[PDB]
DNA sequence: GCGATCACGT
DNA sequence: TACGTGATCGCA
């Protein structure tokens, strides 16, 4: 069973062919600045395993890595591009990555590792990492003879794979989705996660301190109202607090006993001063384990940068993850808590934080899928969307609009989008199940073109069994057929939704690259730092922003051609915070 | 360790 | 109502 290789104790000419599967190993999941245990090589000439230490000092080699015309065939590029950034190496020509071929073929396989990927078409002549490493505590690199077959067995099925894996994204029309959008993508994520981002951690200390001492008092005051001390961190404990020793009104149950959610909370603040505490005290309780103490425990000491890692390949509908640390969810909705991205600041001096976001690309998508002419023109005379939607389902002028009823159709819109039930809908506006769906109805009335999409593209995942997006991204619903109501609805609300989603995730990417390449051509120092779904993140020398008040917006709002136009604000400043 | 519940983002 | 990450609790 044992495969054949070389255990290489010296890079050799035959290892340097124009076409080979590569591995560079990085065990620890957290590849920023991390050690590489192993390399692996296959080619036309033979297998082969090289010592890190060796390979990445051997000129030939390095320069091998770097030759952009010597093409390799890998499983999670960014990863090795990554770490041999840090060892300041450049890694060129990787023409075909297995993780994200497999990702976009299906990607709720949830493939991320070489085995995973092979065993999608029946090759399982390689084991799963986590069988070779083992995971948490026991997780460690084996001796020398374990961990080189492993890799060469690794590097063995992505040379074997490529074809097939290409093959049936051919079939797919998403050979391009590949080469062109997620491929040129992954190098773009790798230099933005290695640039990283600077943080004033001073400035983090301080709020850390504030917020203990105001955390301190809240606490105090939540006991005295209680008449006791308790652990407010625990759903647990706190419901009983609430509803058994102060007999509060038991308005929403959870899986497991009485519902804490803050949705609950704000219906029974009226009854006792205790629930205002407990919501502030929550606020601020996540602002200081979360953002603070978790950004200040990520942060690295010598730089003050946090290199976050974007998961390329893991969401069902083609947008990004971020962790480690998630920089896509950082504060902004309550000002306490959007002060924190005061503490995120441009990396050099003199320099300043631009943002571009999309304005409503998920309802601009909508509009351009559905074809509703009454949405498109909304869009097409930028309209505020939520006042239209409130001046239709509620048939009054502009000036009839009042703002309870902006606020119900701009939860309507969002909720159209998610595939929102007229329970649900109750739910979030806190109203009936026949009155949401009267709203419903008469957003339908408005657009009849979006109520044609939704009934079309739930028979469309029924009869083909998926769904796709703009730049023919793929998410299969098996669900869609289920016999079981529940199941089966939530399957509809994600044909629905994922060709939103999805083709407004393809479109920042694109954009992304499109962004790339115009900062390269006009030789700008500007670079990308973050994307949140629907915005980009880049600092860049004071000096450069009228030119990119022009350019980001241009290139963004240019990425793809729609029905209707795209519209990008953008905003820059000292800070994050600031760069609004 | 892991499911349940909470809260943060688009 | 769509899609995420992760801190904390509590029993295994
Ligand atoms: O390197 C990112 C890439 O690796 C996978 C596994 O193939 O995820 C690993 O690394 C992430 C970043 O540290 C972790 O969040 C994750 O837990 C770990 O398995 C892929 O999912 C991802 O695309
Ligand atoms: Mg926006």
């Known amino acids: 069973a044992k495969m054949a290789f070389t255990l290489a104790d010296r890079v050799t000419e035959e290892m340097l062919a124009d ?20 390399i692996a090589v296959v080619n036309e000439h033979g297998r082969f395993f090289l010592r890190p230490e060796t390979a990445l000092a051997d000129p030939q080699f390095v320069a091998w890595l770097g030759d952009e015309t010597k093409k390799k065939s890998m499983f999670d590029s960014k990863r090795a591009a990554v770490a041999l950034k840090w060892k300041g190496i450049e890694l060129c020509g990787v023409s075909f990555d297995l993780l994200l071929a497999a990702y976009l073929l299906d990607p ?10 092979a065993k999608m078409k029946q090759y399982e002549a390689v084991r799963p990492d986590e069988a070779v490493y083992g995971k948490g505590a026991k997780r460690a690199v084996p ?17 074997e794979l490529e074809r097939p894996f290409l093959d049936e994204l051919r079939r797919n029309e998403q050979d391009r989705l590949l080469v062109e959008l997620e491929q040129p993508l992954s190098s773009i994520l790798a230099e ?44 647990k404990q706190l419901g009983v607090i609430l509803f058994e020793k102060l007999q509060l009104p038991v308005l929403k149950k959870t899986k497991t006993g009485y519902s804490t959610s803050a949705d609950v909370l704000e219906k029974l603040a009226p009854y006792h001063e205790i629930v205002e505490n407990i919501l502030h005290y929550r606020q601020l309780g996540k602002l200081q384990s979360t953002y603070i103490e978790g950004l200040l425990k990520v942060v690295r000491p010598d730089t003050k940068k946090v290199h976050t890692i974007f998961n390329q390949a893991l969401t069902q509908t083609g947008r990004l993850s971020s962790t480690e640390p998630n920089l896509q ?18 990396s050099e001096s003199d320099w300043l934080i631009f943002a571009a976001d999309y304005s409503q690309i998920e309802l601009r998508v909508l509009a351009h899928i559905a074809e509703d002419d009454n949405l498109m023109e909304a869009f097409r005379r930028d309209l505020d969307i939520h006042t239209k939607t409130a001046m239709d389902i509620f048939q ?15 939860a309507v819109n969002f909720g159209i989008v998610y595939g929102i039930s007229d329970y649900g809908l109750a739910q979030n506006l806190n109203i009936s ?38 730049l023919h991204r793929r998410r299969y619903l098996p669900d869609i057929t289920s016999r079981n109501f529940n199941v089966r609805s939530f399957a509809e609300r994600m044909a629905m939704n994922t060709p939103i989603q999805g083709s407004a995730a393809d479109i920042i990417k694109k954009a992304m690259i499109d962004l790339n390449a115009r900062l390269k051509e006009e030789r700008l120092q500007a670079h990308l730092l ?51």
């Open 19 to 38: 076409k080979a599967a590569l591995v560079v190993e990085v065990v620890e999941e957290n590849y920023h600045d991390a050690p590489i245990v192993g």
């Open 433 to 470: 199940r026949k009155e949401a769906a009267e709203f419903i109805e008469r957003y339908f009335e408005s657009f009849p073109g979006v109520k044609r999409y939704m009934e079309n593209i739930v028979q469309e995942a029924k009869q083909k069994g998926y769904v796709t997006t703009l």
């Open 108 to 117: 709720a396989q949830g493939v991320d590792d070489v085995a995973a990927a």
């Open 192 to 235: 933005m996660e290695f640039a990283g981002v600077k943080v004033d951690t001073k400035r983090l200390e301080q709020m850390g301190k504030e917020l203990a001492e105001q955390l301190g008092t809240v606490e105090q005051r939540i006991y005295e109202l209680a008449g006791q001390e308790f652990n407010i961190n625990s759903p």
């Open 530 to 580: 973050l994307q949140v779904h629907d915005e980009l993140i880049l600092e860049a020398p004071k000096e450069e922003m009228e030119r990119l008040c022009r350019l980001v917006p241009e290139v963004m709002e240019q990425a793809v051609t729609l029905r209707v136009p795209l519209k990008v604000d953008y905003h820059y400043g000292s800070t994050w915070y600031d760069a609004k």
């Open 143 to 159: 001796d020398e003879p374990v961990l080189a077959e492993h890799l060469v067995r690794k590097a063995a099925a992505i040379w």
């Open 396 to 410: 009054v002028s502009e000036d009839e609009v009042t703002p309870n009823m902006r606020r119900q159709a701009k």
């Open 329 to 346: 969810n950082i504060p902004i909705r309550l000002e306490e808590g959007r002060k924190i991205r005061q503490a995120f600041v441009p």
